[PDB]
Amino acid sequence: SHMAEAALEAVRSELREFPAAARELCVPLAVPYLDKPPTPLHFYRDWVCPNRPCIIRNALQHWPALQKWSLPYFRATVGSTEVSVAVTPDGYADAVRGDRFMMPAERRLPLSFVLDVLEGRAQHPGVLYVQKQCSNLPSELPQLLPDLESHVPWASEALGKMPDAVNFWLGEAAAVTSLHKDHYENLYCVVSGEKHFLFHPPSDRPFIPYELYTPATYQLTEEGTFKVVDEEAMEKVPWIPLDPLAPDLARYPSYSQAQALCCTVRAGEMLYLPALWFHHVQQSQGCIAVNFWYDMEYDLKYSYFQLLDSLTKASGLD
Amino acid sequence: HMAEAALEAVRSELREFPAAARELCVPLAVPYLDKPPTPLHFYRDWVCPNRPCIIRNALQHWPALQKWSLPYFRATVGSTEVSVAVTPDGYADAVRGDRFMMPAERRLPLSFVLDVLEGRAQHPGVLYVQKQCSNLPSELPQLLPDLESHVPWASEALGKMPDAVNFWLGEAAAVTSLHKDHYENLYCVVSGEKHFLFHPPSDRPFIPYELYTPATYQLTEEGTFKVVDEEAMEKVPWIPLDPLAPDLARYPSYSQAQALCCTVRAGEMLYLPALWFHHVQQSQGCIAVNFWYDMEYDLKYSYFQLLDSLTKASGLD
Ligand SMILES: O=C(O)CCC(=O)C(=O)O
Ligand SMILES: O=C(O)CCC(=O)C(=O)O
Ligand SMILES: [Mn+2]
Ligand SMILES: [Mn+2]
């Protein structure tokens, strides 16, 4: 029917207009800074409920980590501790490589070897990143807990809950985190160096491509090479093929209608990365960071994003 | 071919969304709070999730709660002239036949309104003090010292003072038809009771809307009502359906919506969240006050706009 076709083009048109309408109301042109930690209520009303990012300054002054932490300090304090290390040939763990979703090779290594690689004292095949997540800071590096807080009190009070995980990040500058989103409210604390975040708001979903990929894992051979081993037990994983830094607009032309939001988080600063926001992460050499993950609330904003996601696919936009 | 399959997929998702959203975000019964919440709790537990609740013991400081009554009004502000909505049948701002009917507005001394409520005097049609536009401070200023000009914990939570404070005093036949407001509403019943039927905003795909030419009631000298079309008025979208007696032959999809009902009693305060569809019935001479805070125009608002546009665009409305 011709009337049916007109209704579908009106739907597709509304979906395509939504990211611009939403960003005009809800999304800042630049990530704003706070000069000091907000009150819990201010945090909930100004940032959490509206689901929008900010960087908080002067929130890590109680952390001994801010003065002490460095690669030599780590060597002295936890250098012999065994940690899960992610390894990839090119620095892209959990990323689309060709026709597969590639997961990294996980290797258990003393932290001193990571420090050696980062300081150029040693050579290793590929790119190293201590990225395990899964609350790896209390689990693998408990000796470091005295150097920081077990949670961000004003944020825990605001969200009415405690952190579900506290993660330690340490990697080469070549280790890049490709575009993805999380089901968590994220307080990302850069202790040393700098992180470069590229964001897309949830409302850009109509212009963010997703594809289904066979999952596979890198395997490091004794000869210093990387094998691709398929994960037969996993179902195909949906992932964003697109590289926000050099997007393949010939394949995904509609991505040009998305709009990226960029910011840099420096030592001493805390990024609030709101739940469901797409993000892509780069780092300076041996950047040290800690992030607190608080579980998001499964509320109206979550239901709406599920609708937006489903409609993006049902309508043919993705 | 492909277009018809993509459209029914889209339509199916829109039809499935009200159940998914309510099963996750909408209570089966309006919850009660034993006492006023803290601002943070109010915002986190009710405002941000866009969830209604009834607060008990929130007006016990109000002198109005011990003093207000029709006889107290008679003695205190009886001679005061107030704006009164008059309709033949008690449905102001409602779809009647093929028109959106606006009430006849009359300036009457409160005494007379009180006589009508008490059966002392008769009057054609149905009266309702329902001007809104912050009519309490505007028309009954003498009553202000009997209550707070705002709800402090709610103003702190929302970071702003109320945009309006309204006084409500009507007959039992004066019914408010289904509609939604872009305000956070703290609705306070001082005397009598109010019966609220709700639909959450996510029921929009199943709530019918139509465009109506607007008209107004004129009370004749003969004691009857005429309809005067508002020729210089753009048409007004409104919900043709009575949620309590829905016309399921005309709007069958409305059976897929799910209403949520509650009663608010003297001394109780209802938080009616922004964009929630509500229909209101009252007891004869019910006395109520409500505080309107403009809503925040954030992601939740943008999502509802998209849901609203897609409902029309897909042909579900
Ligand atoms: O720091 C990174 O490389 C990625 C961080 C991230 O994605 C997260 O904290 O959710
Ligand atoms: O009390 C009534 O009759 C209607 C109340 C209402 O619609 C409101 O307070 O927004
Ligand atoms: Mn992440
Ligand atoms: Mn209303």
XYZ file of C-alpha atoms and ligand atoms in Angstrom:
657
model
C 0.000 0.000 0.000
C 1.101 3.543 -0.711
C -0.450 4.808 2.506
C 1.472 2.120 4.406
C 4.715 3.282 2.777
C 3.948 6.877 3.790
C 3.429 5.829 7.411
C 6.769 4.010 7.428
C 8.654 6.987 6.014
C 7.014 9.183 8.654
C 8.235 6.764 11.339
C 11.761 6.658 9.916
C 11.710 10.442 9.671
C 10.747 10.810 13.343
C 13.469 8.388 14.433
C 16.012 10.311 12.365
C 14.927 13.637 13.873
C 15.054 12.371 17.446
C 18.852 12.461 17.980
C 19.038 16.147 17.059
C 15.917 17.016 19.056
C 17.206 15.107 22.076
C 20.720 16.581 21.985
C 19.371 20.137 21.771
C 17.460 19.644 25.038
C 19.625 17.160 26.923
C 23.221 17.065 25.663
C 25.885 19.748 26.293
C 28.200 21.098 23.615
C 31.164 20.380 25.901
C 31.463 18.243 29.006
C 31.060 20.678 31.929
C 33.346 20.923 34.942
C 32.448 21.174 38.619
C 34.939 22.987 40.861
C 34.178 20.697 43.815
C 32.055 17.646 44.605
C 28.300 18.286 44.453
C 25.739 17.490 47.091
C 23.989 14.125 46.636
C 20.753 15.869 45.623
C 22.551 18.166 43.185
C 24.326 15.140 41.748
C 21.070 13.271 41.233
C 19.114 16.223 39.846
C 21.774 17.943 37.730
C 23.536 14.906 36.256
C 22.192 11.434 37.106
C 18.460 11.782 36.421
C 19.031 13.922 33.279
C 21.646 11.290 32.302
C 24.377 13.738 31.323
C 28.136 13.737 31.889
C 30.332 16.047 33.896
C 33.896 16.175 35.207
C 34.329 16.851 38.928
C 37.476 18.610 40.080
C 38.976 18.447 43.553
C 37.132 15.218 44.439
C 40.227 13.034 45.027
C 42.046 15.140 47.630
C 41.559 12.517 50.360
C 43.305 9.855 48.240
C 46.924 9.117 49.197
C 47.022 7.576 45.706
C 47.017 11.046 44.174
C 50.476 11.881 45.547
C 52.047 8.408 45.743
C 50.910 6.370 42.741
C 53.422 5.892 39.926
C 55.115 3.025 38.112
C 58.139 2.940 40.494
C 55.840 3.162 43.522
C 53.836 0.233 42.150
C 57.041 -1.724 41.570
C 57.974 -1.245 45.232
C 54.517 -1.963 46.646
C 52.870 -4.631 44.443
C 55.452 -5.324 41.750
C 55.487 -9.063 42.435
C 51.691 -9.399 42.471
C 50.188 -11.571 39.735
C 47.454 -9.831 37.739
C 45.254 -10.612 34.771
C 46.678 -8.802 31.744
C 44.856 -8.422 28.438
C 47.006 -8.848 25.319
C 46.168 -8.095 21.677
C 48.248 -7.722 18.502
C 47.141 -4.135 17.816
C 45.712 -2.638 21.026
C 42.013 -3.267 20.260
C 40.530 -5.630 22.835
C 36.780 -6.291 22.664
C 36.534 -4.868 19.171
C 35.462 -5.890 15.683
C 38.454 -7.144 13.683
C 37.460 -8.279 10.211
C 34.567 -10.734 10.476
C 34.897 -11.414 14.212
C 34.350 -9.832 17.597
C 37.818 -10.216 19.093
C 38.343 -10.750 22.766
C 41.882 -10.390 24.159
C 44.326 -13.021 25.257
C 44.296 -13.012 29.048
C 47.665 -13.753 30.636
C 48.567 -13.992 34.311
C 51.769 -12.018 34.815
C 53.533 -10.254 37.675
C 52.781 -6.563 37.657
C 56.512 -5.826 37.420
C 56.527 -7.212 33.872
C 53.763 -4.790 32.898
C 55.815 -1.962 34.390
C 58.854 -3.189 32.453
C 56.925 -3.067 29.162
C 55.469 0.363 29.947
C 58.869 1.786 30.905
C 60.506 0.347 27.773
C 62.680 -1.955 29.893
C 61.226 -5.007 28.114
C 59.516 -6.012 24.883
C 56.378 -8.127 24.508
C 54.357 -9.163 21.445
C 51.377 -6.903 20.924
C 49.860 -4.380 23.316
C 49.426 -4.745 27.078
C 46.543 -3.387 29.134
C 45.531 -4.208 32.704
C 41.798 -3.911 32.028
C 40.188 -6.992 33.579
C 37.410 -5.038 35.378
C 35.292 -7.439 37.506
C 36.302 -5.349 40.526
C 39.964 -6.247 39.988
C 41.320 -3.620 42.392
C 40.138 -5.322 45.616
C 40.408 -8.789 44.047
C 43.928 -8.659 42.567
C 45.541 -5.562 44.181
C 44.211 -5.383 47.771
C 47.537 -3.891 48.929
C 46.505 -0.670 47.175
C 43.138 -0.203 48.904
C 44.579 2.072 51.652
C 45.588 4.558 48.950
C 41.990 5.495 48.032
C 38.331 5.325 49.029
C 36.180 2.211 48.772
C 33.439 4.360 47.208
C 32.574 7.950 46.372
C 30.426 8.907 49.397
C 28.394 11.715 47.827
C 27.655 9.476 44.841
C 26.802 6.394 46.909
C 24.415 8.475 49.027
C 22.859 10.021 45.905
C 22.299 6.682 44.161
C 21.253 5.051 47.429
C 23.676 2.184 46.893
C 27.283 1.116 47.133
C 29.602 0.359 44.209
C 29.130 -2.967 42.471
C 32.761 -2.927 41.325
C 35.959 -0.919 41.713
C 38.388 -1.401 38.842
C 42.077 -0.612 38.343
C 43.241 0.444 34.874
C 46.836 0.496 33.641
C 47.879 0.194 30.018
C 49.969 1.263 27.085
C 48.981 4.312 25.058
C 48.221 1.942 22.154
C 45.446 0.162 24.076
C 42.154 1.608 22.842
C 38.649 0.865 24.077
C 36.267 0.703 21.138
C 32.742 2.108 21.177
C 30.366 0.402 23.588
C 27.905 1.220 26.344
C 27.493 -0.076 29.890
C 24.557 -0.702 32.226
C 26.357 1.242 34.986
C 26.742 4.687 36.436
C 30.487 5.213 36.171
C 32.746 7.447 38.261
C 36.042 7.370 36.404
C 39.026 8.700 38.377
C 42.277 9.428 36.536
C 45.144 9.287 39.043
C 48.046 9.848 36.639
C 48.317 10.771 32.975
C 45.203 11.487 30.923
C 42.266 9.709 29.305
C 40.556 10.903 26.129
C 36.875 9.973 25.983
C 34.693 10.158 22.891
C 30.973 9.927 23.745
C 27.680 9.467 22.004
C 24.473 9.936 23.997
C 21.985 7.043 24.150
C 19.678 9.089 21.906
C 22.170 8.759 19.022
C 21.305 5.049 18.813
C 19.459 5.513 15.477
C 22.740 6.517 13.784
C 25.060 4.084 15.616
C 25.475 0.838 13.632
C 25.374 -2.591 15.214
C 26.187 -5.935 13.641
C 26.251 -9.561 14.756
C 29.719 -11.089 14.958
C 31.047 -14.535 15.589
C 33.098 -14.160 18.796
C 36.730 -15.181 18.926
C 39.724 -14.845 21.215
C 43.348 -14.046 20.501
C 45.783 -16.787 21.432
C 49.455 -16.023 21.905
C 51.860 -18.678 20.633
C 55.289 -19.440 22.090
C 56.728 -17.812 18.941
C 55.186 -14.436 19.780
C 52.318 -14.660 17.280
C 48.583 -14.218 17.735
C 46.085 -16.904 16.708
C 42.344 -16.335 16.298
C 40.352 -19.070 18.104
C 36.574 -19.022 17.688
C 34.327 -19.302 20.758
C 31.913 -21.984 19.605
C 30.094 -21.859 22.974
C 29.138 -18.170 22.613
C 26.236 -16.940 20.553
C 26.955 -14.202 18.035
C 27.682 -10.920 19.815
C 26.220 -7.560 18.712
C 28.880 -4.871 18.465
C 29.557 -1.494 16.849
C 31.836 -2.012 13.795
C 32.491 1.689 13.432
C 35.746 3.442 14.353
C 34.691 6.882 15.695
C 38.124 8.311 14.851
C 38.072 7.241 11.186
C 34.486 6.239 10.423
C 33.693 4.166 7.333
C 30.950 6.479 6.109
C 30.780 4.589 2.802
C 29.409 1.593 4.738
C 27.537 3.504 7.478
C 26.706 6.898 5.957
C 24.035 7.609 8.580
C 26.708 7.841 11.281
C 27.433 11.361 10.008
C 24.095 12.326 11.593
C 25.367 11.233 14.992
C 27.383 13.778 16.946
C 30.341 12.833 19.098
C 31.153 14.586 22.364
C 34.822 14.634 23.337
C 36.603 15.407 26.586
C 39.915 14.762 28.302
C 40.151 13.641 31.926
C 43.414 14.595 33.621
C 45.114 13.484 36.823
C 43.068 14.431 39.875
C 39.776 14.671 37.964
C 36.697 12.440 38.126
C 34.462 11.817 35.118
C 30.821 10.914 35.585
C 30.047 8.697 32.597
C 26.270 8.193 32.648
C 24.656 4.813 32.174
C 24.005 3.635 28.590
C 26.223 6.351 27.087
C 28.373 5.077 24.247
C 32.045 5.677 24.854
C 35.416 5.166 23.230
C 38.560 5.546 25.309
C 42.193 6.429 24.638
C 44.960 6.944 27.178
C 48.472 8.300 27.611
C 51.370 5.897 28.233
C 51.004 4.174 31.593
C 47.910 6.167 32.490
C 46.647 5.055 35.913
C 42.926 5.147 36.574
C 40.321 3.807 38.963
C 36.617 3.705 38.240
C 33.613 2.942 40.406
C 30.685 1.127 38.835
C 27.269 1.667 40.377
C 24.401 -0.359 38.993
C 21.928 1.705 37.049
C 18.267 1.862 37.939
C 16.042 -0.080 35.516
C 13.478 2.690 35.219
C 11.611 4.669 32.548
C 14.788 5.866 30.816
C 15.831 2.211 30.448
C 12.472 1.139 29.004
C 12.573 4.053 26.560
C 16.055 3.160 25.351
C 14.905 -0.406 24.746
C 12.069 1.019 22.652
C 14.462 3.296 20.750
C 16.820 0.367 20.167
C 14.055 -1.972 18.973
C 12.497 0.699 16.745
C 15.883 1.518 15.199
C 16.048 -2.119 14.050
C 12.358 -2.758 13.254
C 12.336 0.347 11.022
C 15.453 -0.623 9.053
C 17.651 2.243 10.269
C 20.140 -0.328 11.614
C 6.306 -5.709 0.808
C 9.325 -4.780 2.886
C 7.618 -1.571 3.926
C 4.545 -3.401 5.194
C 6.714 -5.835 7.166
C 8.834 -3.034 8.641
C 5.711 -1.081 9.596
C 4.027 -3.976 11.391
C 7.303 -4.645 13.213
C 7.348 -0.993 14.305
C 3.652 -1.129 15.232
C 4.195 -4.322 17.229
C 7.010 -2.694 19.221
C 4.861 0.359 19.975
C 1.984 -1.892 21.073
C 4.315 -3.981 23.255
C 5.952 -0.984 24.940
C 3.116 -0.028 27.359
C 3.166 -3.484 28.983
C 6.968 -3.652 29.143
C 7.163 -0.138 30.597
C 4.423 -0.639 33.202
C 5.664 -4.082 34.237
C 9.030 -2.453 35.020
C 8.149 1.103 36.115
C 4.478 1.427 37.116
C 3.051 0.163 40.435
C -0.142 -1.863 40.649
C -1.289 0.365 43.538
C -0.416 3.942 44.453
C 1.970 3.700 47.437
C 1.621 5.642 50.681
C 4.367 7.455 52.576
C 3.961 7.723 56.356
C 5.493 11.212 56.429
C 7.115 13.735 54.086
C 10.227 12.371 52.359
C 13.609 14.016 52.308
C 14.227 16.067 49.137
C 16.766 13.536 47.895
C 14.411 10.617 48.558
C 11.552 12.458 46.877
C 13.605 13.096 43.756
C 15.296 9.676 43.583
C 12.315 7.529 44.588
C 9.434 9.372 42.910
C 10.350 12.316 40.666
C 13.154 10.799 38.595
C 11.305 7.484 38.029
C 8.104 9.462 37.326
C 6.116 7.477 39.927
C 3.038 8.589 41.930
C 2.669 8.391 45.693
C 0.388 9.656 48.465
C 2.065 11.401 51.412
C 0.303 11.204 54.758
C 0.805 13.762 57.535
C 2.249 16.420 55.210
C -0.317 19.143 56.017
C -0.566 18.849 59.806
C 1.241 22.190 60.103
C -1.391 23.834 57.885
C -3.962 25.878 59.839
C -6.271 25.157 56.891
C -6.347 21.497 57.884
C -8.002 22.301 61.199
C -9.976 25.383 60.082
C -11.110 25.138 56.474
C -14.768 24.322 55.910
C -17.652 25.810 53.979
C -18.865 27.606 57.144
C -15.335 28.900 57.767
C -15.250 30.149 54.172
C -18.672 31.787 54.554
C -17.497 33.782 57.583
C -14.024 34.560 56.249
C -14.283 35.196 52.486
C -17.988 34.736 51.770
C -18.466 38.109 50.068
C -15.343 37.611 47.918
C -16.075 37.366 44.188
C -14.454 34.316 42.570
C -14.215 32.849 39.082
C -16.589 29.909 38.690
C -16.821 27.429 35.833
C -20.397 26.583 34.851
C -21.463 23.746 32.552
C -24.783 21.957 31.963
C -23.438 18.516 32.876
C -20.289 19.053 34.958
C -17.714 18.334 32.220
C -15.629 21.452 31.643
C -12.769 21.199 29.143
C -14.184 18.007 27.672
C -15.243 16.563 24.337
C -19.040 16.730 24.013
C -20.401 15.458 20.720
C -18.142 16.974 18.061
C -16.699 19.808 20.132
C -14.185 20.478 22.851
C -16.389 22.347 25.313
C -14.988 25.092 27.507
C -17.001 26.229 30.533
C -19.009 29.369 30.974
C -17.052 31.569 33.393
C -18.969 33.601 35.969
C -17.884 35.951 38.752
C -19.937 34.929 41.784
C -19.606 35.755 45.474
C -18.273 32.722 47.282
C -21.353 32.781 49.535
C -23.529 31.899 46.554
C -21.252 29.043 45.496
C -21.454 27.782 49.077
C -25.256 27.989 49.123
C -25.398 25.927 45.932
C -23.009 23.312 47.351
C -25.073 23.054 50.547
C -28.411 22.831 48.732
C -29.539 26.235 50.028
C -29.921 27.563 46.505
C -30.335 26.080 43.057
C -28.444 26.976 39.926
C -28.610 25.700 36.340
C -25.957 23.170 35.469
C -22.891 22.423 37.576
C -20.506 24.839 39.314
C -16.777 24.328 39.873
C -14.249 26.768 41.256
C -11.483 25.517 38.947
C -9.901 28.613 37.388
C -6.313 27.439 38.013
C -3.837 30.138 36.825
C -2.773 30.294 40.488
C -6.304 31.250 41.536
C -5.729 30.816 45.293
C -3.299 33.776 45.639
C -5.098 35.665 42.843
C -8.694 35.467 44.089
C -8.642 34.160 47.682
C -5.598 35.951 49.137
C -7.201 36.146 52.587
C -6.810 32.340 52.802
C -3.033 32.283 52.218
C -1.949 32.442 55.913
C -3.826 29.149 56.441
C -1.309 27.163 54.366
C 2.204 27.224 52.970
C 2.873 29.028 49.690
C 4.876 25.945 48.643
C 5.894 22.465 49.739
C 9.416 23.090 51.122
C 10.844 19.577 50.760
C 9.459 19.375 47.221
C 10.757 22.806 46.231
C 14.187 21.850 47.545
C 14.048 18.552 45.645
C 13.086 20.203 42.358
C 15.306 23.258 42.858
C 12.502 25.704 42.151
C 9.422 27.329 43.575
C 5.938 26.437 42.321
C 4.731 28.007 39.090
C 1.123 27.997 40.359
C -0.964 27.473 43.480
C -4.574 26.587 42.695
C -7.753 26.352 44.752
C -10.378 23.728 43.887
C -13.964 23.724 45.152
C -16.680 21.998 43.148
C -19.831 19.926 43.099
C -19.794 16.145 42.995
C -20.981 16.305 39.366
C -17.971 18.458 38.380
C -15.645 15.912 36.736
C -12.216 16.615 35.243
C -11.732 14.636 32.037
C -8.642 12.657 31.083
C -5.661 14.886 30.261
C -1.999 15.375 31.141
C -0.033 18.402 32.359
C 3.615 19.374 31.910
C 3.921 20.017 35.652
C 4.993 18.145 38.718
C 1.842 18.284 40.826
C 1.504 18.138 44.601
C -2.236 17.833 45.074
C -3.503 18.487 48.600
C -6.999 17.540 49.759
C -8.072 19.685 52.719
C -11.650 18.385 53.001
C -13.675 15.626 51.372
C -12.018 13.335 48.882
C -10.821 13.123 45.294
C -10.908 10.027 43.094
C -8.062 9.847 40.600
C -7.776 7.529 37.627
C -4.268 7.463 36.129
C -2.574 6.260 33.020
C 1.219 6.447 32.903
C 2.701 8.358 29.948
C 3.814 5.059 28.415
C 0.140 4.181 27.841
C 0.065 6.864 25.115
C -0.082 4.349 22.205
C -3.487 3.182 23.484
C -4.932 6.568 24.482
C -6.902 8.148 21.607
C -6.530 11.799 20.625
C -8.531 13.818 18.115
C -8.766 17.405 16.911
C -11.927 19.276 17.868
C -13.176 22.701 17.001
C -13.385 24.574 20.316
C -16.611 26.001 21.684
C -17.829 27.586 24.907
C -21.035 27.334 26.907
C -23.226 30.432 27.196
C -25.777 30.585 30.012
C -28.944 32.115 28.554
C -31.336 34.415 30.377
C -33.842 31.530 30.215
C -31.628 29.320 32.401
C -30.315 27.092 29.595
C -26.950 26.576 27.927
C -26.010 27.411 24.354
C -22.840 26.417 22.499
C -20.836 29.279 20.953
C -18.057 28.073 18.651
C -14.760 29.893 19.214
C -14.299 30.892 15.579
C -10.957 32.634 16.240
C -9.427 29.536 17.879
C -7.179 26.834 16.498
C -8.524 23.326 16.925
C -7.511 21.594 20.156
C -6.402 17.954 20.492
C -8.167 16.119 23.284
C -8.981 12.615 24.479
C -12.551 11.656 23.416
C -12.724 8.664 25.739
C -14.168 8.387 29.233
C -11.647 6.097 31.005
C -14.314 4.905 33.433
C -16.870 4.114 30.702
C -14.698 3.702 27.607
C -16.249 3.372 24.158
C -14.464 0.191 23.088
C -16.266 0.033 19.727
C -14.743 3.381 18.720
C -11.400 2.927 20.558
C -10.892 -0.841 20.980
C -7.138 -0.548 21.517
C -7.811 1.282 24.786
C -8.464 -2.108 26.413
C -4.684 -2.587 26.094
C -4.033 0.384 28.356
C -4.120 -0.195 32.104
C -5.540 2.362 34.490
C -4.295 2.964 38.018
C -6.796 4.400 40.491
C -6.531 5.982 43.903
C -8.454 8.075 46.392
C -6.925 11.079 48.156
C -8.488 11.996 51.489
C -8.507 15.010 53.773
C -5.005 15.632 55.061
C -3.364 13.625 52.265
C -1.045 14.935 49.545
C -0.770 13.231 46.157
C 2.343 13.444 44.016
C 0.963 13.295 40.480
C 4.021 13.029 38.203
C 4.533 15.133 35.112
C 2.845 13.898 31.908
C 0.719 11.332 33.764
C -2.780 11.159 32.298
C -5.356 11.846 34.994
C -9.126 11.947 35.368
C -10.578 13.417 38.568
C -13.842 13.022 40.480
C -14.618 14.751 43.765
C -17.008 14.592 46.653
C -19.616 17.334 46.953
C -17.896 20.487 48.151
C -14.422 18.929 48.226
C -11.763 21.505 49.126
C -8.347 21.032 47.552
C -5.187 22.975 46.817
C -2.455 21.970 44.389
C 1.070 23.182 43.688
C 2.363 23.088 40.114
C 6.098 22.989 39.449
C 7.120 23.172 35.818
C 8.681 19.895 34.799
C 12.244 19.503 33.597
C 12.557 19.195 29.820
C 15.049 16.358 29.810
C 15.532 12.935 28.263
C 12.287 11.543 29.692
C 10.418 14.421 28.058
C 12.152 13.907 24.709
C 11.356 10.195 24.831
C 7.679 10.863 25.428
C 7.605 13.294 22.497
C 9.061 10.575 20.284
C 6.559 8.041 21.633
C 3.763 10.545 20.983
C 4.883 11.339 17.427
C 5.451 7.666 16.610
C 1.986 6.768 17.897
C 0.466 9.186 15.370
C 3.000 8.507 12.603
C 2.547 4.723 12.759
C -1.250 4.979 12.621
C -1.882 3.621 16.121
C -3.672 6.882 16.891
O 39.296 3.028 30.409
C 38.994 2.367 29.392
O 39.820 2.073 28.501
C 37.566 1.904 29.231
C 36.742 2.319 30.451
C 35.281 1.927 30.331
O 34.778 1.597 29.278
C 34.419 1.943 31.500
O 34.871 2.346 32.577
O 33.241 1.548 31.402
O -9.009 18.359 40.584
C -9.415 18.230 39.409
O -10.627 18.133 39.122
C -8.397 18.191 38.290
C -7.002 18.398 38.871
C -5.960 18.480 37.781
O -6.224 18.166 36.628
C -4.620 18.943 38.131
O -4.392 19.295 39.311
O -3.737 18.977 37.247
Mn 32.788 1.075 29.442
Mn -4.468 18.174 35.475
